[PDB]
Every structure is written in C-alpha cells, then in structure tokens.
C-alpha cells in the first residue's frame, strides 16, 4: 500500500495509541518480548521491544516479505527512548538506477562502512526520550552518486520504546510541528 495514498506532508506508519498499532508490521520475536505499557515520564502508552539478541527480535514494516510499501517522503522520523542497551534500525530505499540500498544505523559500531548494498552508520543517543530524523535523501546523495526516489521497508530492532514513527517532507521545527506529533 501507500502507492494510492495521498502522501501529504505527514504520514504515520505506526502509532502507539490505537486499537491495533502493529497492524501492518510483522513481529518476529525470539528470546525477547513485546508489550504496551504506560511510560512514567510522558504519561502515555508506548510500544516496548526488549530482547537478548538484537539480531533476532525485530518488527518489519510490510507483513508480506515479498510485498513492499511505497513512500516518496524524504524524511523518516522516529521517537525512541534510550534504554542504554544495543539498538538498531534498517531502511530500504530505491534510487534512480533502480537498485535497492540499505541504511543500517547501529548503536554498537564505530566505523562507517559503505558497500554497494549496505551502508552501516554509528549513532549516539541522549539519556531520555529523543526524536531522530533520518533525511534519507541526503544519505542517498552522500553514500552513492544517485538520488532518493522511494522507500521500500523499515525495520527496527530490540531494546527500544517506540511511539509515533512517521514520515515527513520538510525539516519541521518543534514550534511549527502539529500537537499530536510533539514529544510533550
């Protein structure tokens, strides 16, 4: 889906306040657990993923592995809470040359390695809640000479509390952001 969508300035793929948050996402958990508890600092329900092996427990965006969703939005935004544990997320994009790239941002690596299919990045997080904005277009331009066209899937791993992961088209500031997308 998302090919016939309107795809306005904002577009959400997972929201922690709803009847079925993980409706399109495919959970695949082993030696881990998934929950929905109320966090003690934002006073709202959040989706909590925790596991021993970060490479086993994850949730992918499209339920069907063969099927892929279509997003033309440049920016991808995550609202995550740092649990001081290993955590990573991976995204697939399509460039003008019609090949599939991968951008994996990891908490437990130091080097920045660039391969034709995988580009692994390090990342550092603050103490509590923080929103991260990916800017897929800039990463596509820097890692490869090509440019961003489409996003094929997003995949987030264990040891993180997720709420309101969404796409965007501009570097929105906190003041101009709508209320429902804010941190407080």
């Amino acid at each position: 889906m998302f090919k016939n969508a309107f795809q306005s300035g904002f577009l959400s793929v997972l929201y922690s306040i709803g009847s079925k948050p993980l409706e399109i996402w495919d959970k695949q958990v082993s030696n881990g657990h998934i929950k929905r508890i109320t966090d003690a600092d934002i006073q709202s329900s959040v989706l909590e993923i925790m596991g021993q092996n970060v490479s086993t427990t994850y949730i992918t965006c499209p339920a069907d592995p063969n099927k892929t969703l279509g997003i033309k939005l440049p920016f991808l935004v995550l609202i995550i809470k740092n649990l001081n544990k290993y955590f990573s997320f991976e995204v697939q994009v399509l460039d003008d040359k019609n090949v599939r790239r991968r951008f994996r941002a990891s908490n437990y690596q130091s080097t920045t390695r660039v391969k034709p299919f995988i580009c692994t990045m390090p990342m550092r997080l603050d103490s509590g809640w923080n929103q991260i904005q990916f800017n897929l277009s800039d990463f596509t331009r820097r890692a490869y000479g090509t440019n961003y066209i489409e996003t094929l899937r997003v995949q987030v791993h264990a040891n993180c509390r997720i709420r309101r992961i969404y796409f965007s088209d501009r570097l929105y500031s906190e003041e101009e952001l709508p209320a429902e997308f804010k941190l407080f």
């Binding site: 130091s110 660039v114 990045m121 390090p122 550092r124 890692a143």
Partner: peptide, 13 residues
C-alpha cells in the same frame, strides 16, 4: 580520541 571521534559520528567520503 580520533579512534573514538571518527567512530562515534557518521562520516562519508
């Protein structure tokens, strides 16, 4: 310090 700085932020070519 370099082995930490070039290893904590993402840097491309």
């Amino acid at each position: 310090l370099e082995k930490l700085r070039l290893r904590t932020y993402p840097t491309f070519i």
